[PDB]
Amino acid sequence: MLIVPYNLPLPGGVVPRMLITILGTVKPNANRIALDFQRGNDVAFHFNPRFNENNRRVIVCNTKLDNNWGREERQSVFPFESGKPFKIQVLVEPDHFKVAVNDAHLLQYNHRVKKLNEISKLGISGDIDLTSASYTMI
Ligand SMILES: O=C(NC[C@@H]1O[C@H](CO)[C@H](O)[C@H](OCc2cc3c(F)c(F)ccc3oc2=O)[C@H]1O)c1ccc(F)c2ccccc12
Numbered sequence: 001m002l003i004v005p006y007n008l009p010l011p012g013g014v015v016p017r018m019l020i021t022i023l024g025t026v027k028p029n030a031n032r033i034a035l036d037f038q039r040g041n042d043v044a045f046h047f048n049p050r051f052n053e054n055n056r057r058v059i060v061c062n063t064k065l066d067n068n069w070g071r072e073e074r075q076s077v078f079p080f081e082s083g084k085p086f087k088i089q090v091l092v093e094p095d096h097f098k099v100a101v102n103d104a105h106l107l108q109y110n111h112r113v114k115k116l117n118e119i120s121k122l123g124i125s126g127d128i129d130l131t132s133a134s135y136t137m138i
């Protein structure tokens, strides 16, 4: 129901206690999904489910500074399934983004970009039907 890629403004950036919720459905033959929490051209937090990286499924997380990708953080727990509805929740904590999918904790990503209040856009891209993208303070 939403156009992909989708740009969700985060007015005044993010802050601890901010909860971002993404609802959608993975497409049948999916290859990749991405959520990009952006500070201008920088990507503070790139969350990238990969359905076929050397014939394994993995989540790659990273940061892009001055157009250069940094050290990737991988996690092999992979809760997405092609063709299935998902909920990603990203809770901003003091020292990390905390990600839960379908109400189960998945991973944490320490803040490399420190200017939380300047991470003012979330890009949602890839092989999904996007249902909703929203935020709230908890
Ligand atoms: O390309 C790979 N690695 C280099 C880069 O790694 C970065 C993280 O360190 C980024 O993931 C970068 O991708 C950027 C990107 C992703 C993207 C996406 F995920 C979408 F769903 C849609 C559009 C996208 O456009 C992009 O530029 C990506 O190009 C890559 C390598 C090896 C693989 F097996 C891959 C499998 C799936 C996807 C990417 C790869």
Ligand SMILES: [Cl-]
Binding pocket: 112, 113, 114, 115
């Ligand atoms: Cl910074």
Ligand SMILES: [Cl-]
Binding pocket: 133, 134, 135, 136
């Ligand atoms: Cl909202």
